[PDB]
């Protein structure tokens, strides 16, 4: 179900997760959960994985404005821009597929999915989101548009193949719905419909009810009944923090969007400071730039590297030996100064 | 491959003797090569009776024996059915397992069908909320089912709007099937005297609508 992605979108009807602090600290099934993080990239590539169809239509055609919500208040198709991704900055997108979304974003302390699928504007099911660049290159700027360099990096290739890996779920979601059972006075009404019941026997094992079909209990309410939401139509892939009623499972699997592969890197390693050769030495005054790993390398010598990330004007006095200093400092190539009389 | 060659067209009569010919295209038969012919039931359900030059059929008419005829599987079958139209398969099983040649498909007389029994109405309003219209005009059990279908809503058959579904035959020669007039919803309101005018075997089925 990745040749059309909607086969994998239809195998996994999404449900709410352990949304522990959506408001201040209000905790329940959160409708836009935080399932996994997919950020092993040197392409500045976050990926969020959660339990809604953010990248899967109802029939499964990837509607832009259809991002699929899924709850016991059921599967629906909420907005395409109204999915909140808040990393403490704007959740910039690179793409999205089903229960995943790959993106670039300058990081923070908390990622926060914001549930807004026409039942709300936002709801901030958040997570302690570490995200920091550690960028490539000698130079220290993250500005892609200037033309000064091209290094190698690895970024999330945004092609819509089926999978390289595949996450999945079974032992199915006996799930967060216990207010179904209709009121009998000392009995109960099995109010059947909408989903599968997952009942339990206290006075009568007809209180043990699976159904979208209703029944009767006599002499047993809560306290002598049992009711939970035990239905199907969802392969629930990564449900942590709300355990399934199954300790014994048979899962189904689906692939991983945005597979990380090799790319370039437009890195802006600009010109360094000014180098006057002196009476036995030489000296380059580095100006300010983006924070650049300067390396004055006595290349052949005892390699005390005049090397550090730099952000001010510094004074790289390379007293040049016969072995010759290498000013290869911050996003340029080297320079092999040989001392002379 | 192999060729146990006989008449791969087979034309029978009422109670008709399916003489499933297969003389050996290489030459002469044997029971180690298994020159056999067993008659084949509907939906391409070959069930081998006249087995390998040694057997008759289990529960079939008793006149059927796929045996040595010519230098191949000559299958003499006297006393066939009225609607037993199916593939009398000439199997050659060369001391390991049965591989097929062609097998003579046999279709006979006895019990010819009628005109196509008319189910021809513009169907319920589920398509008319989509801005569509698919009226169902068809026959049931037409025989000899050589169907001429003029499919044009608004009365006159034009090459669009019409549609033919699968007109499918049974074992007993009953072959009537459906089709539609497939146009718009307000376009299905634009014309109401549409249909599918069908005719097979001298019997003509009127698919006419009302809207």
């Amino acid at each position: 179900s990745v040749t059309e992605h909607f086969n994998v979108y239809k195998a996994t009807r999404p449900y709410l997760a352990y949304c522990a602090d959506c408001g201040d600290g209000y905790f329940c099934y959160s409708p836009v959960a935080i399932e996994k993080i997919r950020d092993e990239a040197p392409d500045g590539m976050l990926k969020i994985q959660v339990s809604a169809q953010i990248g899967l239509d109802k029939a499964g055609t990837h509607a832009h404005t259809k991002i699929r919500y899924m709850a016991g208040h059921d599967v629906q198709e909420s907005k395409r821009d109204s999915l909140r991704v808040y990393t403490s900055a704007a959740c910039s997108i690179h793409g999205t597929m089903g229960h995943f979304i790959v993106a670039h974003c300058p990081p923070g302390d908390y990622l926060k999915v914001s549930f807004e699928d026409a039942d709300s504007h936002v709801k901030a099911c958040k997570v302690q989101y570490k995200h920091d660049p550690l960028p490539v290159g000698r130079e220290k700027f993250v500005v892609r548009p200037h033309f000064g360099v091209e290094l190698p990096c690895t970024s999330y290739q945004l092609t819509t193949a089926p999978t390289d890996e595949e996450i999945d779920m079974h032992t199915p979601p006996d799930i967060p719905d216990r207010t179904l059972l209709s009121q009998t006075a000392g009995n109960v009404k099995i109010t059947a419909g909408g989903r599968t019941i997952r009942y339990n026997c206290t006075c009568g094992r007809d209180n043990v009810g699976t159904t979208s079909t209703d029944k009767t209990i006599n002499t047993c309410k809560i306290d002598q009944c049992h009711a939970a939401v035990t239905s199907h139509d969802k392969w629930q892939f990564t449900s942590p923090f709300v355990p399934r009623a199954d300790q014994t499972a048979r899962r189904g699997k689906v692939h991983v969007p945005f597979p990380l592969t090799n790319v370039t890197c437009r890195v802006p390693l600009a010109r360094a400071p000014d180098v006057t050769y002196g009476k036995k030495e030489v000296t380059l005054r580095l100006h300010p730039d983006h924070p650049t790993l300067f390396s004055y390398r006595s290349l052949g010598a005892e390699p005390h590297p005049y090397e550090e990330w730099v952000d001010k004007f510094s004074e790289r006095i390379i007293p040049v030996t016969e072995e010759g200093i290498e000013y290869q400092w911050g996003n340029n190539p080297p320079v092999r100064l040989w001392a002379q009389l | 491959q192999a060729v146990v060659t006989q008449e791969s067209a087979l034309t029978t009569s009422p109670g008709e003797t399916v003489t499933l010919t297969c003389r050996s295209n290489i030459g002469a038969v044997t029971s180690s090569n298994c020159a056999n012919w067993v008659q084949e039931k509907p939906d391409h359900f070959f069930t081998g009776l006249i087995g390998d030059t040694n057997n008759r059929r289990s529960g079939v008419p008793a006149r059927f024996s796929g045996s040595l005829i010519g230098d191949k599987a000559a299958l003499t079958i006297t006393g066939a059915q009225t609607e037993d139209e199916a593939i009398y398969f000439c199997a050659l099983w060369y001391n390991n397992l049965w591989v097929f040649g062609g097998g003579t498909k046999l279709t006979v007389l006895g019990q010819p069908k009628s005109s196509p029994s008319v189910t021809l109405f513009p169907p319920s309003s589920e398509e008319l909320e989509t801005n569509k219209a698919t009226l169902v005009c068809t026959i049931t059990d037409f025989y000899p089912g050589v169907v001429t279908v003029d499919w044009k809503v608004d009365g006159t058959p034009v090459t669009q709007g019409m549609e033919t579904t699968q007109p499918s035959k049974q074992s007993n020669n009953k072959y009537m099937a459906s089709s539609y007039l497939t146009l718009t919803a307000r376009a299905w309101e634009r014309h109401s005297s549409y249909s599918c005018q069908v005719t097979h075997e001298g019997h003509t089925v009127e698919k006419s609508l009302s809207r």
Binding site: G60 | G48, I87, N96, L97, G103, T119, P123, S178
Partner: protein
């Protein structure tokens, strides 16, 4: 006869593989082989080899190497040809045979495999009944039209599946990469309309099905 419960009509996944079983029941035929038939497209039963009952031994023809598997799950009487090598130039019938009357004698089922690309829409069934003006004879022709099956399957039951004495049907036929037909039968004067002689359409692989009852527009 040790009769076949055939693997279904299946659209082909590309490069794919499975053990397409003709469940060869009627006994535990464990000392009994069969011809594991490939329903060739023109040729009919051009079987690419045979199965065994307990040995499971697939005798192999000269063409089924590559996309062929021999599968013999004969513990409850199952034989089968494995559809390996999913490609669009193979898709035909798949049958069995048990080896009684010592060549292949218990002629199996035959299930329609179709190697191909298909739709992302399965069939849908619609109720087409007697009209809001009349349409009323001794035979009142209705049913459900089950169309658009990309990929397979499609199956249409009459009377909601119960009152189905002869609901004449078109199977999945070609339209836009979707298998399409209609399963429609007559009700009597007392077959409908208050007695719900309803056309039910189904697509089990693509899961596109609905039962549309004995209720017309009048």
């Amino acid at each position: 006869q040790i009769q076949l419960v055939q693997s279904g009509r299946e659209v082909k996944n590309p490069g794919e593989t499975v053990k397409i079983s003709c469940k060869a029941s009627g006994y535990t035929f464990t000392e009994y082989p069969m011809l594991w038939v490939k329903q060739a497209p023109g040729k009919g039963f051009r079987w690419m080899g045979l199965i065994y009952t307990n040995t499971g031994e697939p005798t192999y023809a000269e063409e089924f190497k590559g996309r062929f598997v021999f599968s013999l799950e004969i513990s409850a009487s199952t034989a089968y040809l494995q559809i390996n090598n999913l490609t669009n130039e193979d898709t035909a019938t798949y049958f069995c045979v048990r080896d009684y009357f010592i060549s292949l004698d218990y002629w199996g089922q035959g299930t329609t495999l179709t190697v191909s690309s298909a739709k992302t829409t399965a069939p849908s069934v619609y109720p087409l009944a007697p009209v809001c003006g009349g349409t009323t004879g001794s035979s009142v022709t209705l049913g459900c039209l089950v169309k658009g099956y990309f990929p397979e399957p499609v199956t249409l039951t009459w009377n909601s599946g119960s009152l189905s004495s002869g609901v004449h049907t078109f199977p999945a036929l070609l339209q836009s990469g979707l298998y399409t037909l209609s399963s429609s039968v007559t009700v009597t004067s007392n077959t409908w309309p208050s007695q719900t002689i309803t056309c039910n359409v189904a697509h089990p692989a693509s899961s596109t099905k609905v039962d549309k009852k004995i209720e017309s527009r009048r």
